[PDB]
Structure 1
Amino acid sequence: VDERPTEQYSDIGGLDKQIQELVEAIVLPMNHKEKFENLGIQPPKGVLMYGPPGTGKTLLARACAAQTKATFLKLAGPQLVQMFIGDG
């Protein structure tokens, strides 16, 4: 469980719209959860992200954990396909 993934958004490049969407997807509702409760609605709870197999979703997740300075958990689909019962 790494805590410091060491990204400043200067490591990830070319996903500027994607990274702004990242920020407003997780950290922006996190700091302004009070403005979410003012609306009387619950914040978004997860993000669906897709791309080619070598498109760097992992590093973007690290960068997100970096600027949000939060702890970082991680699960892998190809890790979860085997290991039979227990993945859950």
Structure 2
Amino acid sequence: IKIMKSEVLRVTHELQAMKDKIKENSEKIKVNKTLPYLVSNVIELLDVKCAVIKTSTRQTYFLPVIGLVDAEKLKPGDLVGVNKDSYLILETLPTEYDSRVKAMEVDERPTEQYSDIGGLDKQIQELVEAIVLPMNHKEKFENLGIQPPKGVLMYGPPGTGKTLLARACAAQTKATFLKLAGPQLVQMFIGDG
């Protein structure tokens, strides 16, 4: 019967003291998290809990402590907003895609049936069986235990129908086509490509 009064009083007192002290600590952390958040990437994670961060200013700093996030929920390559000057990680950032990458996605879905391609029946069959057939089947390809090839290189003289076949494949597939060009992935800034 003593445990009622003694324990309830003590535990509620510790609850309230710890609660307002947690609110104080959280307020201090929030006010200390200066918003600018210089964006940086974790190039590697190493044990002492410590990280090597390459900032968007093209310079890499070692961090004696991780910061305000958890080291377990991190890996190489993640986007983290570090402090402008302290360079300490303040929060993790969701996967960010450049405007060029988003524009790279096919949204108009050009309409080109395979009937518009003449003289390439074997080539169309190879492309559809290497790029589309392993896509919407998958599990049965594993059932036969046969490895579907990872990539296809369409090569030949100009005007043979390479880009035409690619456009037709984008037309007659439900996959999210991601078109691009070689010169697109060439930029002034180091590491931009």
TM > 0.5 between the two?
yes
For Structure 1 versus Structure 2, the TM-score category normalised by the shorter chain is 0.7 to 0.9
Q: 1:18 to 1:41 in 2, by over 3 A?
A: closer
> Do 1:6 and 1:66's aligned partners in 2 also have CA atoms closer than 8 Å?
yes
Q: 1:69 to 1:32 in 2, by over 3 A?
A: closer
TM-score, reference length from structure 2:
0.39
Per-residue CA deviation, residues 51-82 of structure 1 (Å, 9 max, x unaligned), is 11222211111111111132321121244456
Structure with more strand by fraction: 2
* Partner SS for 1:10: helix
Structure with higher Rg: it is 2
* Partner SS for 1:6: coil
> Do 2:130 and 2:148's aligned partners in 1 also have CA atoms closer than 8 Å?
no
Distance 1:87 1:55 in 2: 32
Runs of 4+ in structure 1 displaced over 6 angstroms? none
Q: 1:9 to 1:60 in 2, by over 3 A?
A: same
Percent of aligned pairs with the same residue?
Answer: 100
> Do 1:62 and 1:72's aligned partners in 2 also have CA atoms closer than 8 Å?
no
What residue ranges of structure 2 are gaps of 5+ in the alignment?
A: 1-105
Per-residue CA deviation, residues 34-60 of structure 1 (Å, 9 max, x unaligned), is 112224455322101101122221111
What residue ranges of structure 1 are gaps of 5+ in the alignment?
A: none
TM-score, reference length from structure 1:
0.76
Q: 1:45 to 1:3 in 2, by over 3 A?
A: farther
